[PDB]
Amino acid sequence: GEPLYTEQDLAVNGREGFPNYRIPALTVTPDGDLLASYDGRPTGIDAPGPNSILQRRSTDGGRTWGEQQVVSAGQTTAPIKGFSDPSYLVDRETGTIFNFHVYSQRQGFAGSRPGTDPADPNVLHANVATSTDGGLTWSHRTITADITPDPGWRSRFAASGEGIQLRYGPHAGRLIQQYTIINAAGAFQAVSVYSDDHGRTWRAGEAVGVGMDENKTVELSDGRVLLNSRDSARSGYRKVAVSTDGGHSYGPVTIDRDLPDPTNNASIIRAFPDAPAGSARAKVLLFSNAASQTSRSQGTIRMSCDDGQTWPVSKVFQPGSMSGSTLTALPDGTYGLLYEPGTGIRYANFNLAWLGGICAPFTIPDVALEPGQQVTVPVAVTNQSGIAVPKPSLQLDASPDWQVQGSVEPLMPGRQAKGQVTITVPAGTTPGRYRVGATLRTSAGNASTTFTVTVGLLDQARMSIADVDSEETAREDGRASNVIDGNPSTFWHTEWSRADAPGYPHRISLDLGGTHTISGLQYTRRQNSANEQVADYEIYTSLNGTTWDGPVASGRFTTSLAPQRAVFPARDARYIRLVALSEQTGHKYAAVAELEVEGQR
């Protein structure tokens, strides 16, 4: 295990006949050839851009690549046709290879109309190309009618990247390709499309979830099928669900907080696809996405050793731009990684020695303290490695003027290990919530986690709305309580859905749950609208809840998206009130995403 990481460009925007290349799919043929597929985009856009599905082949394990060839050719003139968003699926029992993609004419995903007739240009069709000669030549089929059991499903696309064939269970041999559909209610849902006859016929299973999008599946160590999805509702994380029936139907969808995502595609595969059911090796998954929540950047590989329950292991492969990626397992024990660096489509090859992980997921809880204080938090390491590590270390990534150190007891096979982290925060430090990184470093590899240190802010969990002048709840979720949920994506909104609703001034008052020394209020505006922004304000406080002292602070907030501080000399108070005197440009309504209170718990 000498570490290996290499890359090379396969398509470069503005070279070889297209101004833009995106949307990677990668597989290994029954004869060991690597196939890389992707869009060529004549007008640089998603469907219904007149796109082509392209393919390059490597016959030497990915070292060198042959000519760019056209699998499905778009038409830029009469009539306009596009083929976009490839996904490979190899039937390893028959040798047959499929490449799923859209067939667009007038409409893409958003515009597609109900119907399944291949001649209808108002439908985004579902196509599949089939090859029986290792991807040299292809025949083409439209399968929309076959995969549309509900005439309310007006639009669909196969998730680009690579589908799977089940190896375990009563449904062994089944081919599974994930799609996103839009139903008659307008929701985006995930669904598995599958074949039990080696691609002769395809059908849709039961749709799952809401706020879904491009999504992927993988067969777990016990033969359940794990679904991992882009979140069209923009949580900043991946969504997950599990099937016990070979991908036909799924349970409840949940967010996976250990998988940050900027709302984009990602890949998940078995590290050991031939490992037997129930084995340790069968539990190992690899994952690729952009780890940034704020841009398509910080492309990262992660590894789970427990069927995707935890993700102890991570390493950055692309610190810069990284706007799509797909993983495949190579015959030589390494992994291919076909991704978008911003320059087109790039092929990378890495091994597990490069990734450098140990299967030892660990936890550190979130902690609160005051500036000028120290606190110690416990560490719990679950050793899934099966080996002893006599001298593990813990390395923390925190503000450079803080003092942070930690330690962990030796790792033992099959056991939990304990540790600790002490944090000292200097006097004066600005109140806020501070993310802190932690890396378990061992001779056998590394694992990591993160936790939040809250400094100088009261506990929102003890706070409640004492009073508010107005709130919208009829047409949207504008609850006053939204200010104290720690989420900048949810907001208090004053009532707007009745004409008689009040205009300015507005007012929101918090019960802190108890009397505290306080010295500040932090305000965060509504993030996705500019027309209900607080401008002029006064802050008042109360020891007993009806008699208000103040203004203790006044001013005019800005249009900054970040927390804005209104500070005041320290005073004891059970209640704090924000009077919103005015809106930035005189609109009627007030919205606030967050309020936090600077004080001593």
- Per CB under 6 A, residues contacting ligand SLB are 23, 46-47, 84-85, 102, 108-109, 157, 213-214, 232, 264-265
The site partner of 27 among ligand SLB, Na ion, none (C-beta below 5 to 8 Å per kind) is none
Q: 467-504 burial, b if ≥16 CB within 10 A, otherwise e?
A: ebbbbbeeeeebbbebbbeeebebbbbbbbeeeeeeeb
Task: Please give the Cα distance from 592 to 479 (Å, whole number).
Answer: 10
- At closest approach, how far in Å is the CB of 266 from ligand SLB? 10
User: Is 142 a binder of Na ion (CB under 5 A)?
Assistant: no
Q: Which stretch binds Na ion (CB under 5 A): 1-9, 183-191, 368-376, 480-488?
A: 480-488
Please list, in sequence order, all residues whose beta carbon lies within 8 angstroms of the beta carbon of residue 241, skipping any fewer than 6 positions away: 190, 208, 209, 226, 227, 229, 250, 251, 252, 253, 254
The site partner of 485 among Na ion, ligand SLB, none (C-beta below 5 to 8 Å per kind) is Na ion
268/438 with CB nearer ligand SLB: 268
- At closest approach, how far in Å is the CB of 108 from ligand SLB? 5
Plot region of 256 (φ>0 → left; ψ -120 to 50 → alpha; else → beta): beta
485/536 with CB nearer Na ion: 485
Residue count, binding to Na ion (CB under 5 A): 6
- At closest approach, how far in Å is the CB of 582 from ligand SLB? 38
The site partner of 46 among ligand SLB, Na ion, none (C-beta below 5 to 8 Å per kind) is ligand SLB
- At closest approach, how far in Å is the CB of 104 from ligand SLB? 8
- At closest approach, how far in Å is the CB of 47 from ligand SLB? 5
Long-range CB pairs of 498-501, under 8 A, 24+ apart, other chains included: 498/474, 501/470, 501/588
Q: Which stretch binds Na ion (CB under 5 A): 19-27, 37-45, 148-156, 479-487?
A: 479-487
- At closest approach, how far in Å is the CB of 114 from ligand SLB? 17
Task: Please give the Cα distance from 575 to 518 (Å, whole number).
Answer: 10
The site partner of 487 among Na ion, ligand SLB, none (C-beta below 5 to 8 Å per kind) is Na ion
User: Is 485 a binder of Na ion (CB under 5 A)?
Assistant: yes
User: Is 490 a binder of Na ion (CB under 5 A)?
Assistant: yes
The site partner of 490 among ligand SLB, Na ion, none (C-beta below 5 to 8 Å per kind) is Na ion
Plot region of 321 (φ>0 → left; ψ -120 to 50 → alpha; else → beta): beta
Plot region of 307 (φ>0 → left; ψ -120 to 50 → alpha; else → beta): left
The site partner of 482 among ligand SLB, Na ion, none (C-beta below 5 to 8 Å per kind) is Na ion
Q: 133-160 burial, b if ≥16 CB within 10 A, otherwise e?
A: ebbeebeeebbbebbbeeeebbbbbbbb
Give the per-residue SS3 of 234-273: CCCEEEEEEECCCCCCCCCCEEEEEEECCCCCCEEEECCC
Q: Which stretch binds Na ion (CB under 5 A): 65-73, 138-146, 188-196, 477-485?
A: 477-485
- At closest approach, how far in Å is the CB of 250 from ligand SLB? 19
Task: Please give the Cα distance from 368 to 438 (Å, whole number).
Answer: 17
The site partner of 85 among Na ion, ligand SLB, none (C-beta below 5 to 8 Å per kind) is ligand SLB
Structure tokens at 385: 């490695």
The site partner of 370 among Na ion, ligand SLB, none (C-beta below 5 to 8 Å per kind) is none
User: Is 487 a binder of Na ion (CB under 5 A)?
Assistant: yes
- At closest approach, how far in Å is the CB of 84 from ligand SLB? 6
Residue indicated by tokens 């669900």: 241
Site for Na ion in 538-597 (CB under 5 A): 593-594
Neighbour tally for 463: CB within 10 Å: 21
Closest to 149 in 3D by CA, of 77, 56, 249: 249
The site partner of 47 among Na ion, ligand SLB, none (C-beta below 5 to 8 Å per kind) is ligand SLB
The site partner of 231 among Na ion, ligand SLB, none (C-beta below 5 to 8 Å per kind) is none
- At closest approach, how far in Å is the CB of 85 from ligand SLB? 5
The site partner of 108 among Na ion, ligand SLB, none (C-beta below 5 to 8 Å per kind) is ligand SLB
108/431 with CB nearer ligand SLB: 108
Residue indicated by tokens 């985004």: 124
Q: How far is CA 55 from the centre of its chain?
A: 28
Closest to 4 in 3D by CA, of 335, 447, 442, 272: 335
Q: Which residue is nearest to Na ion (CB)?
A: 490
Peptide bond into 48 cis (omega under 30): yes
- At closest approach, how far in Å is the CB of 448 from Na ion? 28
- At closest approach, how far in Å is the CB of 9 from ligand SLB? 20
Closest to 241 in 3D by CA, of 265, 217, 222, 258: 217
Query: Bridge-partner residues for 439, per DSSP?
Result: 395, 448
Closest to 264 in 3D by CA, of 241, 291, 287: 291
181/394 with CB nearer ligand SLB: 181
Return residues touching Na ion (CB under 5 A). 482, 485, 487, 490, 593-594
